[PDB]
């Protein structure tokens, strides 16, 4: 039978891929970095407390200016914060209450958001008279929007609960490229520094590397035992980290095509909601369901510090492009800036 031979052949390729990876595992990152000095104690204090949202915060995103900051909340609102002064620049009432993600365009001219309405909404921030009106509603996904990220002002990439990702032409609203391959809800995506590749993490416990301009899946990474809720690139585009419900973070190298490190402790049992690297990639920050944010030594896999200043789940975090601070959003309706 042909269908049986195609199933048999797909198994041999999985074994061939497995043995090729084991042929590269000559040493480990833990052995390699066994010589460098520890980071020591990372003692970060709260500098700002952003008060405004009336319910759970689900997602935030820093602007490239390392000062402006947008967040999405259960109260059906997007708030664009001035982190330096805690003043709210724009409070955007959304057409749908079920917002789940938000993004800040690199130029700062647009923000995006979406959720259980299965739509990515582009909001314009340049109109003089009218204050922040919808410029586009990107419809096409058959499941909830879980994450979206601008490439520039004319293209954006989205992940969805329909197990796919998509690249959009904002001017025409067209879904120009579809990224199929996942077998579960895609939970998060992360663009590479050159915005030519992006990684996605799904509920199939696998992460995938995609070619933006060609629409193909280049590499698939396994290892997590539960859903991957968060993902972000290493600052040089050669590695990425994933946070999962299995209470672990993992680092994956692209060129070696496998996992390098597992960040976990027996005390930590709750899942990870967000991950981010410090500016130099030395620190891996992760948000947890136990109300804490843990700072990990990315090279030695030690606990460097703990951010404890929320009374509910830390649902999102992010480091500024200048590396000056980290923001943490929570289910207690507050954002906090740490450095």
């Amino acid at each position: 039978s042909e269908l049986d031979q195609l199933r048999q052949e797909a198994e041999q390729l999985k074994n061939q891929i497995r043995d090729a990876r084991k042929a590269c595992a000559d040493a480990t990152l833990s052995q390699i970095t066994n010589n460098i000095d520890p980071v020591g104690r990372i003692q970060m204090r709260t500098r700002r407390t952003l008060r405004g949202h009336l319910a759970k915060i689900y997602a935030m995103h820093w602007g490239t200016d390392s000062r402006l900051l947008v967040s999405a909340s259960q109260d059906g609102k997007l708030i664009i914060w001035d982190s330096y002064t805690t003043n709210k620049v724009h409070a955007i009432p959304l057409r749908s209450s079920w917002v789940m993600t938000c993004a800040y365009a690199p130029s700062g001219n647009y923000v995006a958001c979406g959720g259980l309405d299965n739509i990515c909404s582009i909001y314009n921030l340049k109109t003089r008279e009218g204050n922040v009106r919808v410029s586009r509603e990107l419809a096409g996904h058959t499941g909830y929007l879980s994450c979206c990220r601008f490439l520039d002002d004319n293209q954006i990439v989205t992940s969805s609960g329909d197990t796919t990702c998509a690249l959009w032409d904002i001017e025409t609203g067209q879904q120009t490229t579809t990224f199929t391959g996942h077998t579960g809800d895609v939970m998060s995506l992360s663009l590479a520094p050159d915005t030519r590749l992006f990684v996605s993490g799904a509920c199939d416990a696998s992460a995938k590397l995609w070619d933006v301009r060609e629409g193909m899946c280049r590499q698939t990474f396994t290892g997590h035992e539960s859903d991957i809720n968060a993902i972000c690139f290493f600052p040089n585009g050669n590695a990425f980290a994933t946070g999962s419900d299995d209470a672990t973070c993992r680092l994956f190298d692209l060129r070696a095509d496998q996992e390098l490190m597992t960040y976990s402790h027996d005390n930590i049992i709750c899942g990870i909601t967000s991950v981010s690297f410090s500016k130099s990639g030395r620190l891996l920050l992760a948000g947890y369901d136990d109300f804490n944010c843990n700072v990990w030594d990315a090279l030695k896999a030690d606990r460097a510090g703990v951010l404890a200043g929320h009374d509910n789940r830390v649902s999102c975090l992010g480091v500024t492009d200048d590396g000056m601070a980290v923001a943490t959003g929570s289910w207690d309706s507050f954002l906090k800036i740490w450095n």
Partner: protein, 59 residues
């Protein structure tokens, strides 16, 4: 699924993932450490900057 075309699509996908050039983990690990070393000075969260260059420290 019983789809033959779907099974071909998966076999062709696994071949794209199998026929890539992989480097040793030792080289991959060294390049990552060399990046952290080169930029450990530009990382305000790593090597702490004084309160002057910090926009969030009493300004």
């Amino acid at each position: 699924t019983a789809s033959i075309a779907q099974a071909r699509k998966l076999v062709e996908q696994l071949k794209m993932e199998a026929n890539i050039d992989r480097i040793k983990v030792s080289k991959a690990a060294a390049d990552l450490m060399a990046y952290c070393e080169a930029h450990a000075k530009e990382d305000p969260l790593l090597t702490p900057v004084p309160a002057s260059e910090n926009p969030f420290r009493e300004k």
